[PDB]
Each structure stands twice: as structure tokens, then as C-alpha cells.
């Protein structure tokens, strides 16, 4: 926004809205900044599921 | 990746002394920097390097006032008896593989 | 706008126990990591640590001599430091800084350059 230009994420296209819902957790996040270090290196972030 | 970290005011009467520091990171403590005078409303004019042991050079058209220091890893520059003409914007600049960076600004109310 | 402000001073001996806080306002604080500054009377800036976005601290620059520590406050948009044993040479005003990197960055990485320090809070110590 322009006035406030402030960042929300408080935008939701994904789902269209929310229900039944089950489980819910907040904790620490799962990609990493870890950002800060110079160089030419790359932040390959691996997963499994 | 970088810090160049500037200083976006200091107040002071006529004669304080600066010619604005940067700061920079642990990994990359020894690479030399450099700023660009953009003063309000004119283009970068290139006045303000530093290496990393504080030897002093002259620009052209500005008197020999101006000097320079290091410590540590964060990079510190003087002046003695401040006058008129630094209201200005600056740049830090370092060089890194095939990169010109270019740093951030340093857009800066000095009260004169 | 973008301003800080501080607040935490007081009087004591080294190894004392206080509360230094950067109260960050006028932009969001749940995306903005945050530092802290130190200005020894006359001396150049020596930068301590500080907390990402997410919590995580890295207590480096070797001016401290594992002295300071760091915290955050993520919900009240206040910056803390959480702090014990202030020294002599801490006699400082503490103008503490906002990166320009919120975690939603593009182009060059000249993000997280400070943009605007605190007003700044005198804390005398001898
Ligand atoms: C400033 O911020 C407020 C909330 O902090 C915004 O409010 C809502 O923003 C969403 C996202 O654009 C809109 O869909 C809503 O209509 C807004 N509601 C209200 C009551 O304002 C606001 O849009 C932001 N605006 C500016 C200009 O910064
Ligand atoms: C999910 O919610 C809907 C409400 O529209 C309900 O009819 C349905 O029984 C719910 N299912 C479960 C598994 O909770
Ligand atoms: C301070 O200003 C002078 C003016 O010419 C400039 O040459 C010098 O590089 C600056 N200080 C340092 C340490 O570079």
C-alpha cells in the first residue's frame, strides 16, 4: 500500500476461505533465511516429505 | 550478502566532524570502499574512497580538511572544522566478482 | 514514517542487571529484523548482535567479550536486548537502526543497509 507501505500478507487466493479444520501449529519456520554471508554461494534450501 | 551501512543523519554546529562512515561485515572485513557525492539535486560526484588503513587522498576543488581512519571491522572517516558545503548524499560502493555493488545511499540532514 | 526509539538507562556497576529496549514504530514489526547500537563517549560504533525475523541471534564482532545478549519481543513492536552486566565503557547513547530488509526483497541485495537510526537513549556508566 501506498500510505502505510506496510507488507501483509493478509491475502488468501489460495483457499477461497477456511473449514472442518483439524490441526494448527505455529513454531519456528521452515526455510531459513540464514542469509548475511557475501559471496557467489547460492541458498539451496533441500526437503523431504 | 553485504552490509554497507551508512549513517542517515548527525547534528551538529559548524564544525563537526565526519565524512560519513560505513559499515561492513565480519566475512569481508579488509575490502576497500568508496562513496559518490550526490548532493540534492545534482548527479554522484566522486569524492569519498577508503581503504582499509585510513590513508588519506585529495579530491579536486575542496580543501585538505578532510581524513580518513580505520579499526576494527567497521570503517571510520573525519574531517576537521566542518564547513558549508557537505549537504550531500553518499554511496558505498566496495567491488566484489564481477559485481559493482553499488551499495545504499546516504541521504543525510546535517544542520549546517 | 520510519522512527525509533529507545529507553532503559541507568546508573550501576559492571555485572548489573537492566532492560535496554529499541521500541520500533511506524512500520511492521513481525517481518523486520532489528539491531543495536553502542557509542562509546567519542568512540567509533561497535555493533553487537542481533535477531532475525524469526528469533535466531549471532553474538559476534568480538568487541564483546560474551557480555551482551540479545531477545525479541515480536508481538508488542519492541525491539529488546536482553541485557545483564553493563559496564564502564558502555557510558553510551544507543541509537538503534532498522534494516531496510523486510523479507519480501528483490534486485541487488543492498537490503538491510540502515535507513534511519533511533532518537536514542544516554546511559552514563563508570
Ligand atoms: C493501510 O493498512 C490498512 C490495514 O492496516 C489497510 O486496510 C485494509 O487493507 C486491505 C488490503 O488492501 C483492503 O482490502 C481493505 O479494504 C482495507 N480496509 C480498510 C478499513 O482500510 C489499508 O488498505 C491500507 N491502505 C493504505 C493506503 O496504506
Ligand atoms: C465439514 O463441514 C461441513 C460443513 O459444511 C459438514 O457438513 C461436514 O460434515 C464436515 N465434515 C467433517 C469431516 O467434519
Ligand atoms: C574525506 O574527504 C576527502 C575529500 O577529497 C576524500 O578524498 C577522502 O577519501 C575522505 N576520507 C577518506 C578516509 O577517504
Known amino acids: 500500500h501506498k500510505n502505510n507501505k506496510s507488507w501483509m500478507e493478509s491475502e488468501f487466493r489460495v483457499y477461497s476461505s477456511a473449514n472442518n479444520c483439524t490441526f494448527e501449529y505455529v513454531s519456528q519456520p521452515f526455510l531459513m533465511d540464514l542469509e548475511g554471508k557475501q559471496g557467489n554461494f547460492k541458498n539451496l534450501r533441500e526437503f523431504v516429505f | 550478502q553485504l552490509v554497507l551501512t551508512q549513517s542517515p543523519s548527525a547534528s551538529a554546529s559548524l564544525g563537526a566532524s565526519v565524512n560519513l562512515t560505513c559499515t561492513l561485515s565480519s566475512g569481508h572485513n579488509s575490502y576497500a570502499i568508496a562513496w559518490h557525492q550526490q548532493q540534492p539535486e545534482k548527479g554522484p560526484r566522486y569524492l569519498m574512497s577508503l581503504n582499509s588503513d585510513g590513508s588519506h587522498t585529495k579530491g579536486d576543488g575542496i580543501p585538505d580538511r578532510f581524513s580518513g581512519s580505520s579499526s576494527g571491522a567497521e570503517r571510520f572517516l573525519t574531517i576537521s572544522s566542518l564547513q558549508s558545503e557537505d549537504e550531500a548524499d553518499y554511496y558505498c560502493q566496495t567491488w566484489d566478482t564481477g559485481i559493482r555493488v553499488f551499495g545504499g545511499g546516504t541521504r543525510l540532514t546535517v544542520l549546517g | 514514517e520510519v522512527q525509533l526509539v529507545e529507553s532503559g538507562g541507568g546508573l550501576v556497576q559492571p555485572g548489573g542487571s537492566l532492560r535496554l529496549a529499541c521500541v520500533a514504530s511506524?512500520?511492521?514489526?513481525?517481518?523486520?529484523?532489528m539491531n543495536w547500537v553502542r557509542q562509546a563517549p567519542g568512540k567509533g560504533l561497535e555493533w553487537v548482535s542481533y535477531i532475525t525475523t524469526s528469533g535466531h541471534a549471532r553474538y559476534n564482532a568480538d568487541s564483546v567479550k560474551g557480555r551482551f545478549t540479545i531477545s525479541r519481543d515480536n508481538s508488542k513492536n519492541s525491539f529488546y536486548l536482553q541485557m545483564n552486566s553493563l559496564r564502564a565503557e558502555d557510558t553510551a547513547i544507543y541509537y538503534c537502526?532498522?534494516?531496510?530488509?523486510?523479507?519480501?526483497?528483490?534486485?541487488?541485495?543492498?537490503?538491510?543497509?540502515?535507513?534511519?537510526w533511533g532518537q536514542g537513549t544516554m546511559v552514563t556508566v563508570s
Open positions: 537502526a532498522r534494516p531496510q530488509y523486510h523479507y519480501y526483497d528483490t534486485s541487488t541485495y543492498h537490503s538491510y543497509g540502515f535507513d534511519i
Open positions: 511506524g512500520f511492521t514489526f513481525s517481518i523486520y529484523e
